[PDB]
Structures are given as C-alpha cells and as structure tokens.
Amino acid sequence: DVVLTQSPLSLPVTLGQPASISCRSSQSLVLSDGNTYLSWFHQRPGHSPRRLIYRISHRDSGVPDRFSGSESGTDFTLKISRVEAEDVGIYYCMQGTHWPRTFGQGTKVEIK
Amino acid sequence: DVVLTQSPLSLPVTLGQPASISCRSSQSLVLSDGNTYLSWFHQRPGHSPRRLIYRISHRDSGVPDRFSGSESGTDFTLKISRVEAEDVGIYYCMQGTHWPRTFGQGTKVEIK
Amino acid sequence: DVVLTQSPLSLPVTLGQPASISCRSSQSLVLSDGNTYLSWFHQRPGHSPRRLIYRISHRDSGVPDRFSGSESGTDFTLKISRVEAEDVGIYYCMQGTHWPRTFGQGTKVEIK
Amino acid sequence: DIQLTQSPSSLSASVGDRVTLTCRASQSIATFLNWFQQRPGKAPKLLMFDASKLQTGVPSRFSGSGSGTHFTLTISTLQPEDFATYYCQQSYDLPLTFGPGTKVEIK
Amino acid sequence: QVQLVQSGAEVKKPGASVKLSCQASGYTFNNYGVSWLRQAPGQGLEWMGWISAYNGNKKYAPKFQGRLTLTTVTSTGTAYMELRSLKSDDTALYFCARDPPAVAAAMFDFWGQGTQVTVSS
Amino acid sequence: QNITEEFYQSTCSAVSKGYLSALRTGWYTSVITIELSNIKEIKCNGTDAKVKLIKQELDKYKNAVTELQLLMFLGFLLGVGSAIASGVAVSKVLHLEGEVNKIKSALLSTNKAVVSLSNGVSVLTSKVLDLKNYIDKQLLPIVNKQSCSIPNIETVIEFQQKNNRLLEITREFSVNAGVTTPVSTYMLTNSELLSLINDMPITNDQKKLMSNNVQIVRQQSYSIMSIIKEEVLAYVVQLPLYGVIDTPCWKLHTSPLCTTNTKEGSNICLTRTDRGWYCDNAGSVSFFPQAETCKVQSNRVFCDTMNSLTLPSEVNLCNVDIFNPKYDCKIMTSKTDVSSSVITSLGAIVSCYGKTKCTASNKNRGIIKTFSNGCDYVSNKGVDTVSVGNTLYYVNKQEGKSLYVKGEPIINFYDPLVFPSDEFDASISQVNEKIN
Amino acid sequence: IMTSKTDVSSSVITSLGAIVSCYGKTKCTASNKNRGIIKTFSNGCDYVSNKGVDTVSVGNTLYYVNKQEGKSLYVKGEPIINFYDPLVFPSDEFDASISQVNEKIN
Amino acid sequence: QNITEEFYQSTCSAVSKGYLSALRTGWYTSVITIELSNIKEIKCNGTDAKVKLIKQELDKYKNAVTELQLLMFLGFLLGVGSAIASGVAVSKVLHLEGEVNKIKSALLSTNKAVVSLSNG
Amino acid sequence: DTVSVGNTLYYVNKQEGKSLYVKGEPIINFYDPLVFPSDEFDASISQVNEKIN
Amino acid sequence: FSVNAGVTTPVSTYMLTNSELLSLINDMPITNDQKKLMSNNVQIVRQQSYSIM
Amino acid sequence: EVQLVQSGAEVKKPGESLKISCKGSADSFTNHWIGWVRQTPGKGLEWMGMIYPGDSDTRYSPSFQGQVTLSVDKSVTTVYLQWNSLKASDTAIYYCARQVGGVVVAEPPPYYYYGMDAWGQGTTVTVSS
C-alpha cells in the first residue's frame, strides 16, 4: 500500500490570504495510460466530506474559483486562493490507482 | 511563394578567370523524396535562354566543362571555371518544388 | 583465415602457483547469435589431447577446479588455479567460427 | 591518369599577406581534393580535406574553396613556418596523383 | 535536337486579346507540357502558367488568375495562350518552355526564341 | 444520404438501393522508383557501440540489396484473369537491355516523367525515395570521414528512419513472393496515392471519388516487383481505374424460404442464388456474387469488374417479377429445414421454422416481437438484437427508410411431391421444365 | 468435365495467350495500345497470342494478356460441343466424366 | 486430460470426445478510447538533426490524425450475419450530436465509466 | 509416426489419449453399385433410400 | 485502419494488449466460469473478436 | 599523436632485392588503410600503392604494377615493401602513410579517401655501384 503524507497537519490561517496543503506519495501513482490520480476532499464539521479536486489541476463542479492545485513528479498541492469563513473543516488527499485506496491523515483549517 | 535572391546583380568579369553567382531561397526546397531542386539558365542577347544546370552539381547535355555549381542547406552556387567571350548574357536561378515556380532577378555578365 | 597468437610459448612454472596462457585472435570470432567461440585443449606427452574449456568461462566435464578462463572483446585467457605435477604437457587455443578452424602454436608447461 | 596543375608554378609573398593558390584538374573531381604541406626533409602534413574543410589541429587561418575542375586555398596571415611546398591531391579516381608543387618564398 | 518556334511580332490596343502560338518539333510533345513565361523590357521572368499535354492539368500563377487560359493542340504539337485585360504591362517578350507532365519539379530544358507583343495608344 | 431498402415477402428477399458506384474497368500502371546505392564492402572493424550500430544498419542495407537481388454462388463462371498481368508485363519490358537507362535518364532533372519504352508503352515514373541521394552525399561522407566512428547518434536514428521503408519493403517482398496486396503504407503513402490519382489523365469525377476513398482504392490495388540493377529499384503499382462513376447500384439479400408443413421430412425450401451487388454500367449492369469483391463505404460501393459478370438491365426486374418471361431468375432448392437469418442493410430477415424459438428484442424493453412460422422481416429503428434458436444476431443500425412491401411467398406455388431439391444453380424456367 | 446451360461470355488468361469465349451479343475485341482494336472476336471459343496484343475486352470487362516470352502453337480442331445433342445434354453436373456423361446420353 | 477417440469401421469415421466447450452466444461491446490532441500547425523551421526528427514525429502524428479523419460442406445454410453489426451500431450512435460530450465528461475523473447514450 | 499412401506422405497426430477400434462392417456393401446415385453433394440416408427405391 | 478499411480482425496487440484484454474480461457482468475460461485462453478470445472504428 | 616508425637508410647494388618496413600503433591502425608513395629529388610525389591492414587487400598504381609487392602483418602491426629487382632510377625517398576513408565505397569512381594524415619519417633508398 502507498502511504500518503500531508503537510502540515495543523493550518491556522488569516482571512483573505492564500493557503497551501501538500500531499506526498510513497510510490508512483501513474496508471497504465499516464494519468496521475490525486484527489482532494473538504469536510465541514457535522456534515459529510465533499470532493474538491478530482484530477491534478482539475476543479470540480460547483467548486468556486478559490480552489486549485497542480504538481508533477512526486508531490501534489492544494492552493486556496483566498480562505473565507466558510472554509473551516478538514482536508484529505487521496490516491485511486493502488489498492487499497489510501487516504491522508487530514489537515484541520480554521480562521485566526 | 518562395522568393529567390541572386547575388550579385551586376557581374563584370575579366577573361579567363572564374565567376560566382549565388542563389538564396526563402524556404526549404526539399521535396518528399529528398531532392533539392535549383536550376540555372543562361540567356544570350537576342536569343532564348538555355538550361545550364538542372539539379545541384548536375551538368546538362552539351554544357561545357566551364560550368558547375553545388551547395546544400540554404544556398546554391553557380561557378564558372573560366569565363570566355561567349559567356555574355544573363543568368537566372529557378526552383521547381513550390508553386508558383519562382525565378530569380537575373545577373548580367559581360567581359571587362 | 583468422590466425591465433598464444602467449607465451614457453611456460616454466613452480608447483602450487597459478599460471596464465593468453590467446589473441586476428579478427572477430562472434557468430550470428552472439556466442564467441574459443576452446582450450590440454595434451600430455605420449597421449592424445583432451578438451579443457569449450566456451569462454565454461569448464568441461571432469575438468577439475584448477582450470578456468574468461575474457571478452579481443583476448581470451586460460588461468590455472594451482599447477600440479600432472599438468605437464602443451596447451592449444582454438576458434571454431571461421573456416579453416585455426589452432594456436601451443605453449609447453613443465614444473620448475 | 588525371593531370592536376597548380597555379602559379612559383609564388612570392610577404609575411602576413593573404595568398590564394589554385589548382585545376583535367577532369571534374567533385570537391574530393586534399591539401598537403611539406618542408625539405619532412613528411607531408594534411591540412585540408574536401577542398574546404579543416583537419583537426590545422590553424583556422587556412581556408579553402572550389569545386569541379577548379580549386583554391587561401591563407590570411602568412608565417615564415607557413612558407613551404603545397600539394593538392585528387581523391576521385585511381591512381591518386599530385600537382607540380608550389614553393612559397619570402621576397 | 529539340525545337520550339514562335509566331511573329504583333501590336495591339488596350482591351483586345492576345493569342500566341508555340510549335514544337523533334520530340514526343504528348509526354511533356508547356509553361508560358513573360519578359517585359526592364524586368525579369514571370511564370504565368503551366499546362500539360499529357493529362490536361493546368495551374496559373495567383497574380494572373482571371485573365489567363492555356490550350494544348496535340494534333500538331502546339501550345496556345490567351490573355485578356491588356494594359501597358503587356508589352513584353513571351517565352515557351517544356515541363514535366505532372505536378513536380520544373525541367525547363529548351526554350523558344519568343514572340513579341506590344501595346500602345 | 437518402439510402433506401425494400423487403419483398414473395421471395423473402431485400434490395438496398441508393448507392454511388465505383466500377474498376481499367488498370493504371505507375513505375515507382527507389534509387539505391550498391555498397560493395563494409570493411569497418571497430567494436564501439556506435560503430556496432552503424555496421548493423549497413549490414541490413546490404542484406536488403542481396535479398532484392535474389527475388530476380456464381463464382465458377468468373474467368481466371491475372490481376498482376499489367505489372508483370511492364516488369518484363523493363528487363530488356537499355530500359533501365531510359528510366534513369528521364528522371535526372525531375521527379515525374513519362518514359517511352521499347514495347511502345509510355509510363509515368516517379521517384518516391532517393536512398541513393542520402547514401552518397549525406551518409557515406560522414561514415568514411570519421572512419566508421559516428560522432552523434542522431544520424543513426535518421538512417533508421530512412532505411526502415526499404527494410519493410524487403520484408514484404521476401514473405510474399514479390507480389503484395493491398499496397502497404511503406510502398505508397496516402499523400503519394492522392498525388498519383490526381496526375492521372482522366476525368475529374473519378479523381474526386478516388480522393475521397483512397483507402478503398489502396485495398483494390496491387504491387509488382521489377528489376533492381544499376542503382535503382523500380516496382510497378497497379491502381484501379473506375471508368464509371455515380451510377445506381443495389444489393440483393436472400434468405431460405422453406415451408412449415407439419411433417418433418415433407417440407420444401427455396432460395434465390443471385445474392450480392448489381452496379449499373452502360447497357448491362455489373453483377458481383462474391461479396468480398465489393466494398461498401459511406453509401459508396467500390467493386471490381474483373471478378464480375456482364448481364442485361433486366436483372433489376428479377426483384419485381419472379415469373416474368423476359428474365429467368436463378435459385437453389433443398429440403433441409434449418432456421436462420440474414442481416440486411436496413433490417433483418428471419426465417423461423419448426420449434426453433425466434425473437426480436431491444435492450431497454426485452423481447418486443416473437417471430411466428415463416419468413418475416424486422426493421432497424426499433430493435437492436435478434435471436433464432440459441444463436444471436444484431440488426444493422443504419439510418434510412425501409419499405415492407407485402406479398405471398412463392414457395406455396410448388408441389412438395414434385420439388427437385438437388440444384445448386437453377433457373425459374428450367425448374418449371423440371416440374413439367 | 462439368456441364451447364447458362451462357455467360468470359475469358481465361493463359501463360502464353488468352482464350476468349464470345457468345451472344457480348462485344469481344483484342487490342494493343499503339494501334487500338486489332481483332474482333467472332462467336465461339477462340485464342489470341501474347506477342501482338496487350489487352483483351469482353463485353465491358477488361483483361490483360500475359506477356511471357515463349512459343504458342494454335493446334486447330473442331470444338467437341457440336458432338452433343442439346435435347439430351445434362446440365446439372459439377464433377462428371466423359464415359458417364455418355452413359447419361445413352 | 482424459481425451478419448472412437473409430467405427461401419462408416470409416472417427469421433473424438472429451473436450471443454466455449460457445460464443453473445457480443460484448466496449468503447476503447485514445484521447488525442489536434495540433493545428507544426511551424518549426530548424534544419537540425533533433529538430528534423521531432518535426518528422509531429508530421507523422498530424498525418495520422488526418488519415483517421479521412476514414470517416453445409456452409450454404449459414445465415450471412454482420459480425460488426454491434460495433457499427454503437459507432452510429456515437456519431450523433452530444454523445462525444457524454463520453468525455464521464471519463474526466476515472478510467472506466458506464455511459448512457441516446439510443438507451 | 508417419503414414504414406501412393506417393503422398501424412504424419499421424501424436496426441496422448486412448483410441478404441470399434469393429464393424462398412456400410458400402449394403448398396447395389447398379443403383448407386453418384451425383449428390448433400444427401440423406432416407432420401438416398428413396432414390434407391 | 488504412490498409483494412476501418475493420480489423483479429484485434492486434496495438489496439488491445493482453493485460488489457484480461482486465476487460474480468470486468464483464457475467458468471465466474466464463471469466476463468477466457482468462486461460485470452489468445483464442482475441482471435475470435473484432475491432470497429 | 599517432606515430609511424620506418626502417633505416638502405643502400644496394642494382639487381638484388630489398625490403623496407613501417611500424605504427595498435588502436587506430586497424581502421585506416596503409598506402605507399615515392618521391624523387626534383620531381613530384608518385603514388605507389595501398593496402588494408585488416584484409591484406592490394591496389597498385599502373606505373608500379608488377614492379614491387606489398605485404602486411596485423599481429605485429607491420607493413612491408619488397622489390623483385632493383634499378638505378629507383633511388628516392619512400613514405608510408595511413589514409582514412575508403572503408565503404559504392561503384567507384568516386572514391571516399579524404586524408593521408600520418606519414612515416621517410626511408632513403639508394641504388649505387
């Protein structure tokens, strides 16, 4: 199993500024075709998580402009353009190529 | 259309010496097979021009030893071994690969 | 015909020590598949020679541990781990790829 | 077989001058001409092959041009060690033959 | 031994038409085609058009589209070229030459001595 | 494309009309040229990797040269012709003395020239790959100047790219006895095929048809190997000449029409034998019973008249009047009652007899129709799949209109006590004379 | 042999010529490219050489004659079809034999 | 494998029994996808060896795209079916408007997806 | 390993398995050569019998 | 596709590799016995299949 | 860089035979041809012949064909020049020279010889009474 490491594990952020969440894999996630699969998921407290990024630099349906992330080779990124008061929760990165489908530890994000 | 530039445009020459006439293309004249097509034509006053070189470094039928020309990449040459009193006229270079088949301006050659 | 040169031509050796016999070809002995064919033959006085090495670094049946030889490119070697009193005779190298199948001159080996 | 004639048969020049030395072949040799230099008592040294292209180690001051039945060699800055006998050499057909030779002398 | 003979000189007023002939001899014309060229006093040559006597395929220069039409006569091995919209740029010598039967590099091996056409008022 | 189909119950047959024809009436022979250079010896002795590679490529080239030197139902009525007759004729003419010299001298200044051979033939010769060029002035200078030690691997890679065509051509000529069909991409690329079609001395309509279906044209053409001597490899490509374009063409499908008498051994079955394509050319329409000889490509029917038959126009009426006195339709007869289906262009004809279960179904509703006894026809719009017994067919989903032209099947017009069931190619009048 | 009654005109290209069976109203000709039609095949089974002719045409289908170098002998004869009565000819055979066809006639 | 044979002299025939069957009763149609990129122009003009090679590869790719664009004893009782009937049916359905969009949108996040076409 | 008929050569399949030579009288002796119809490509036992009849 | 008029059979290795053929057989909504038979004889399965452009 | 050593000065009486040798190096000598030329005082250099060290193939001049023979030994990287019968007009300076190119040729002429870059130091041969 490929273990994914997230960085950091605690994310205190100030309103309006960008935010960065990195995910680092233990082995190559490149499938037979060439697509590298890392997804990002946002979970607000009390509710279910929601998919945010499905492929690298691919924004999901309804995901606002504030979200984007793209990186190649071994690392992958999650870049928040401007953090708002609605972005509290926890973020997880995910690979889909290797069984079992391993998640990250998850980083908590609150407003300072 | 590929425009061919000749150099020089006036050629005063002394009897017995060599002469040089260069032709320079605006785009590659290499056909599908690989043959690069530049021809040279000699026109004496009052008469029709006559083909002199049909392919690079290919002398034509009846063309005497005095004529030859060979160059690759982007330029092509016309080298007169010894200019005689019969070599008065005007010389033109020609490409045959691109439509329309463009001629040069033509350089005049007289004896000094 | 490919001529094989042996080195040296006289081999005086002391009991228990290693010995070296080199064979050097005049042209490549590589066949169509890729196998390079040089064989070694040991002849004791009064008796017939016996094959010792059939392919490079390939020991023959019944050939004791003391014998081995391996080299690539242009040279080939015969290495005696420990020369004994039974190793008197003459050694020949042989190529089998080119016709005629040329032998070496043969080096004599006695104990000092 | 092929006659190669070098012109001029003899040459005089000063140090540092730009000298052009031609030779004409009795038949088209298609830029397959070489230039060798030789001093008294010394083996010839190849300077140029393909009548224009420099051999590795030959000074870049040497240049060549020509084709068909007319070739020439150009030296930019003459040196007293440059003053020697020069041979152009046909490589088009057998037997390979030399020219009459040119003696470059400082006068 | 290839020969291309052209007609005699001619003088015309602007607005007329020009029909020039180029008779070939000494070779199988049907295996080649003819390109027509122009030489006005003071300028070089200009490829006007090419038409093959083998397949009838023809191609005109962009500058001359709308005025040129070439017609081969194989019964006598002759080329004909029609140009319209005559202006001062028509006083020139017109040249005949052979070319391959198909779209390929131009040979232009033999040329005729030309027919001179002059316009004026 | 306004394609149309008609199903007749009288013969349980189906005619598809509304196609555009392409009928190969002639052969165009073009002399394709690959100028080689016969290297006499590869005397390199270096064991370097690049030297190893370059000697390998030169050895494959020399072995390629040495190999090319070593090379030197109604179907029974079709006349056995030589599809490579024209190419082999031109090759034998090229094998004479002085022909190679003319081919070489004509192409000294151009890429395409018409050469007059000693036979009297004027052939279009075109150099598609001047390996002689790249070898003498672009490859051998480098290899010889550096003394077999190539400085950069890019030249070896481009030598691979250039020599790959010659190596592939040598491969097909070796495993195919000098005759390959269809012409591979290595012998004639698609751009070159388009160019050669455009330069043919023919009408413009044939040019546009072949330019739209270069692929089918290549499938219908041949390649014949000719001389290789004096630094030239010429081979003749034999391209189809469709002397007739845009004619009406219709396809006839037939299914076994058998009766459904209660007794097993007492039924009789009939089947029209003239299935296949009919393309109209001049006075009498072309017929192709061997469906492999016809190719349907976007309503365009490309077929070969050499494997065809010439018949009067009345063959079209073979679909309209089965008892007509002006044409005698051909059929076969038998008594073996096997249920089966033929998938037409705009539907499917299903002959369901005995206890074989036959159904027509679409995937989103299951079985929509249960075929009763007899020869029936199902459309193509509402149904995706058909199943007879336990064998499964799929209905062609082509867009078009189908007309279910009703009729009484003709099998009821014969007495089973008199039906001759030993005919492979029969006729209506001679079967009637057999009944008589 | 095989027997039938369907009269379709067709040709077979031999090694040193071409046999052309021209029946009915089908137009059959032998032509070389430098003179056009040189021979018009009449009714019957005929044979054309390989030296003088390059192409043959029956109806509207075109065949080419093999140009192999060699000698061809036009050994004359009466076609055997005239030895059978059309009222007795069995036209339902795929592999027959001369004696068994004769026994069928008998 | 306990394979068995019987020879009968009565008909001079032979039956071989003891095999395991695999009888094609259906067709499974899968839409294999190769996502290409339509390069509109290869405007490189360098005559370098590597440039020559890369332009050659780009030219083969463009010609490949252009070519793929141009493409758009008892046997007499066997019914002549269309072995490519299912594939050509799915292709014609894909030729409708809006089908390519569904095939593309379904495979944006995964490698394998079941797409519901307009045919059903 | 090999069988030869006339001057044509076939090779016997060397598959591992058991073969039973189930004896019998060939059925050809049950037909009269004076009545045998030799013009059938697809026939049947009962219809051939009806032909004999 | 150019030399075959858009229809090729059997499916070449370039259109569908053996690993991909095994994977596609495994992902079919059918019984397990058919899966194992086709997984053992992927080669014959490829010989019996078609490819349509 | 690469050097070629030749035999010493040679003196002989007309009529007898004579052999001279020219020795080079190991690495490059394998892939270069070895040619011999003659130079007489007051005249130009006259090409005698050429041989390949690998296959011992021979190519002679028209004026020297049958007058003198060439030999080679790859084992000791030696090239030899052997005379059948000396004459008085043969007194000259002889040079061994390695020539690159010519390893692959097709339908010669033209040949693909490009250089004679390394020459021996010259052997002075005198035929005197």
The identity of residue F301, as a single letter, is V
Three-state DSSP state, H101: helix
Distance CA(K119)–CA(G66), nearest Å, equals: 64
**Domain ranges, ordered by start, for chain K:** 5-127
Find which of F94, F123, F287, F310 to mutate to test the G interface (most G CBs within 10 Å of its CB): F310
Tokens 């033509």 correspond to: B106
What b/e readout covers I4-20, taking b as 16+ CB neighbours within 10 angstroms?
Answer: eeeeeeeeeeeeeeeee
Query: How many domains would you assign to chain C?
Result: 1
Residue E44 one-letter amino acid: G
User: Rounded to an integer, what distance in angstroms lies between the CA atom of residue F29 and that of residue F125?
Assistant: 9
Provide the domain limits for residue D65.
4-106
Q: How far apart are CA D42 and CA F9, in angstroms?
A: 106
- CA dihedral for A62, A67, A73, A74, sign (positive or negative): negative
The β-bridge partners of E98 are E34
At G106 the three-state DSSP class reads coil
The three-state secondary structure class of J37 is helix
Residue F38 φ then ψ, to 5°: -75, 95
CB D97 within 8 A of CB D49: no
* Structure token pair of residue F311: 């018949």
Give the span between the Cα atoms of F184 and F186, in whole angstroms. 5
Residue E22 near residue E99 (C-beta atoms within 8 A): no
What is the rounded distance in angstroms from the CA atom of residue D94 to the CA atom of residue K108?
Answer: 9
Distance (Å) of CA H34 to CA H65, H111, J53: 12, 11, 12
Residue K38 structure tokens: 């003659």
Q: Please give the C-alpha separations between residue J51 and each of H88, H90, J6, in angstroms, as whole numbers.
A: 10, 12, 8
Q: Shortest CA distance to B96 belongs to which of B35, B49, B12, B42? A: B35
* C-beta of residue F244 within 8 angstroms of C-beta of residue F26: no
Asked if H80 lies within 8 A of F397 by C-beta distance, the reply is no
User: Taking phi first (over 0 means left), then psi (-120 to 50 degrees means alpha), and beta for anything else, what does residue E85 get?
Assistant: left
To 10 degrees, the CA torsion angle through A39, A42, A48, A51?
-40
Alpha carbon distance C49, B104 (integer Å): 82
| DSSP run (H or E) holding D4 | strand D4-7
CA dihedral (F209, F212, F213, F217) in degrees, to 10, reads 60
What's chain F look like in SS3? Answer: CCCEEEEECCCCEEEEECCEEEEEEEEEEEEEEECCCCCCCCCCCCCCHHHHHHHHHHHHHHHHHHHHHHCCCCHHHCCCCCCCHHHHHHHHHHCCCCHHHHHHHHCCCCCEEEEECCCCCEEEEEEEECHHHHHHHHHHHHHHHCCCCCCCHHHHHHHHHHHHHHHHHHHHHHHCCCEECCCCCCCCCHHHHHHHHHCCCCCHHHHHHHHHCHHHHHHCCEEEEEEECCCCEEEEEEEEEEEEECCCEEEEEECCEECCCCCHHHCCEEEECCCEEEECCCCCCEEECCHHHCEEECCEEEEEHHHCEECCHHHHHHHCCCCCCCCCCCEEEECCCCCEEEECCCCEEEEECCCCCEEEEECCCEEEEECCCEEEEECCCCCCEEEECCEEEECCCCCCEEEEECCCCHHHHCCCCCCCCCECCCCHHHHHHHHC
Query: For residue B96, which residues of chain E lie inside 8 Å, CB to CB?
Result: 104-108
Q: What phi, psi does J42 have (nearest 5°)?
A: -45, -35
Whole-angstrom distance, CA of residue I51 vs CA of residue C15: 101
Strand K18-23's sheet: what is its strand order?
Answer: K5-6, K18-23, K78-83, K68-73
Hey, is J34 helix, strand or coil?
helix
Instruction: Please list every residue in chain H whose beta carbon sits closer than 8 Å to the beta carbon of residue B74.
Output: 47
Phi, psi of K25 (to 5 degrees): -115, -170
User: Virtual CA dihedral for F304, F216, F29, E71, nearest 10 degrees?
Assistant: 100
* Integer Cα distance of F95 and F170 in angstroms: 20
Backbone φ, ψ for residue A10 (5° rounding): -130, 130
Cα K35 to Cα K49: distance, rounded to the nearest angstrom: 6
- Distance between CA atoms of residues K33 and K98, nearest Å: 6
CA-wise closest residue to F7 among F351, F280, F359, F406? F406
How far is B103 from B3, CA to CA, in rounded Å? Answer: 8
H12 contacts in I (CB within 8 Å)? 26
Biggest alpha carbon distance in chain B? Answer: 44
One-letter identity of residue C89: G
User: In this complex, do K75 and C27 lie within 8 Å of one another by their Cβ atoms?
Assistant: no
| CB-based contact C20:C78 (threshold 8 Å) | yes
Q: What is the DSSP letter of B26?
A: S
Q: Check: CB of residue C91 under 8 Å from CB of residue C109.
A: yes
Distance CA F426, CA F330 (A): 5
Beta bridge partners of K69: K82
> Do the beta carbons of residue K98 and residue K117 sit within 8 Å?
yes
CA F422 – CA I38 distance, rounded (Å):
12
Q: Are F180 and F169 in contact (CB under 8 A)?
A: no
- Smallest CA–CA distance, residue D50 to chain F, in Å, is 10
Question: Under 8 Å CB-to-CB from B43, ≥6 apart: which residues?
Answer: B49, B50, B89, B90, B91, B92, B106
Look at residues K120, K80, K81 and name the one whose alpha carbon lies nearest to residue K97. K120
Which two three-digit tokens encode residue A43? 């979970």
Alpha carbon distance A17, C3 (integer Å): 82
* Gap between the Cα atoms of K26 and K77, Å rounded: 7
CATH number at residue D48: 2.60.40.10
Residue E99 near residue E50 (C-beta atoms within 8 A): yes
- CA-based torsion, D49, D52, D53, D58: positive or negative: positive
Query: Which residues of G are less than 8 Å from I39 in CB distance?
Result: 92-93
Q: Are C100 and C4 a contacting pair, CB within 8 Å?
A: no
Longest dimension (CA), chain I: 46
Residue A47's CB is within 10 A of a number of other CB atoms, namely: 8
> By the 8 A CB rule, do I42 and H73 touch?
yes
Burial grade of G24 (CB within 10 A; 0-12, 13-18, 19 or more): exposed
C41: domain range?
1-112
Q: Which of F360, F98, F124, F126 is nearest to F229 (CA)?
A: F98
- Beta-strand relationship, K10-12 and K123-127: parallel
Chains touching F (3+ CB pairs < 8 Å): B, C, D, E, G, H, I, J, K
Distance CA C96, CA F96 (A): 46
Please give the single-letter amino acid code of residue K98. Answer: R
Token pair for residue G55?
A: 């192409």
In this structure, what DSSP letter does residue G83 have?
G
Cα–Cα distance measured from residue A48 to residue A68, given in angstroms and rounded to the nearest whole number? 21
Q: Identify the closest residue of chain B to E2 by CA–CA distance.
A: B50
C-alpha dist (Å) from residue H99 to F196, F364, H65, H92, H104: 38, 18, 20, 10, 9
Q: Is the dihedral of CA A80, A86, A88, A89 positive or negative?
A: negative
Record the tokens describing residue A88, joined without a space: 């509290």
Q: Which residues lie below 8 Å from residue C93, measured CB to CB, with a gap of 6+? A: C4, C6, C21, C23, C38, C39, C40, C41, C76, C78, C103, C104
Of the candidates G57, G78, G79, G55, the residue with the CA atom closest to the CA atom of residue G67: G55
How far is residue K67's CA from residue K83's CA, in Å, rounded to a whole number?
A: 7
- HSE value, Cβ hemisphere, 13 Å, CA-based, for F197: 27
What stretch of H or E contains G22?
Answer: strand G18-22
Chain F interface residues (partner H, CB cutoff 8 A): 73, 152, 154-155, 157-158, 161, 190-191, 214-215, 253, 255-256, 275, 291, 332, 336, 338, 340-343, 362-364, 384, 388, 390-399
In whole angstroms, how far apart are CA G25 and each of F77, F105, G60, H105?
Answer: 18, 48, 12, 64
Set of chain K residues whose Cβ sits within 8 Å of the Cβ of F56:
none
What count of Cα atoms within 13 Å lies in the side-chain half-sphere of residue E68? Answer: 20
Please answer yes or no on whether J5 and F216 come within 8 Å at the CB atom: yes
How many angstroms separate the CA atoms of B79 and B66, rounded? 8
Does B103 contact chain F (CB < 8 Å)? no
Q: State how many domains chain E has.
A: 1
In angstroms, the CA D62 to CA B77 distance is 22
Nearest-Cα distance to chain F for G17, in Å, is: 11
Does D50 contact K114 at a Cβ distance shorter than 8 Å? Answer: yes
Angle at B10 between CA B6 and CA B14, to 5 degrees: 120
Whole-angstrom distance, CA of residue C40 vs CA of residue C103: 10
At J34, give phi and psi (nearest 5°).
Answer: -65, -35
| Whether the Cβ atoms of residue B30 and residue B21 lie closer than 8 Å to each other | no
Q: Measuring CA to CA, which residue among E94, E98, E81, E68 is closest to residue E8?
A: E94
Q: Are F88 and F27 in contact (CB under 8 A)?
A: no
Please check whether residue G65 is in contact with residue F84, taking contact to mean a CB–CB distance below 8 angstroms.
no
At A54, is the secondary structure helix, strand, or coil?
A: coil
Both structure tokens of E59: 């191609």
Q: Considering CB atoms only, which of D55, D94, D95 is closest to K117?
A: D55
Verify cis geometry, omega within 30 degrees of 0, for the bond prior to D100.
Answer: no
| CA F264/CA F247 separation, integer angstroms | 46
Q: With the CA atoms of F272, F273, F279 and F281 taken in that order, what torsion angle do they form, in degrees rounded to the nearest 10? A: -110
For residue F85, what are the β-bridge partners? none
Which amino acid appears at position F52 of this protein? Answer: K
Encode chain C in three state secondary structure: CCCCEEECCEEEECCCCCEEEEEECCCCCECCCCCECEEEEEECCCCCEEEEECCCCCECCCCCCCEECCCCCCEEEEEECCCCCCCCEEEEEEECCCCCCCECCCEEEEEC
Residues of D in contact with F145 (CB under 8 A): 49-50
Neighbouring C-alpha atoms within 13 Å toward the C-beta of F83? 17
Strand partners of residue J44: none
Angle between helices F190-198 and F204-212 in degrees, nearest 10: 170
Q: Does domain K5-127 have CATH number 3.30.565.10?
A: no
Looking at beta carbons, which residues of chain F come within 8 Å of D33? none
Cα angle, residue K10 at apex, residues K7 and K16 outer, rounded to 5°: 120
By the 8 A CB rule, do F199 and F124 touch? yes
Of D68, F39, D58, D43, give the one whose Cα is nearest residue K35. Answer: D43
- Distance CA(F373)–CA(F351), nearest Å, equals 8
Q: Determine how β-strand F20-34 pairs with β-strand F257-258.
A: unpaired
Calpha distance K106→F144 (Å, rounded): 12
Within an 8 Å CB–CB cutoff, is residue C5 touching chain K? yes
Residues whose CB is less than 8 angstroms from the CB of residue H119 and which lie 6 or more positions away in sequence, other chains included: F384, F397, H89, H93
* Domain limits for position E38: 3-119
D16 is written with which tokens? 């540092």
In 3D space, the residue among D78, D80, D60 whose CA is nearest the CA of residue D19 turns out to be D78
Cα B65–Cα B70–Cα B72 angle in degrees, nearest 5? 175
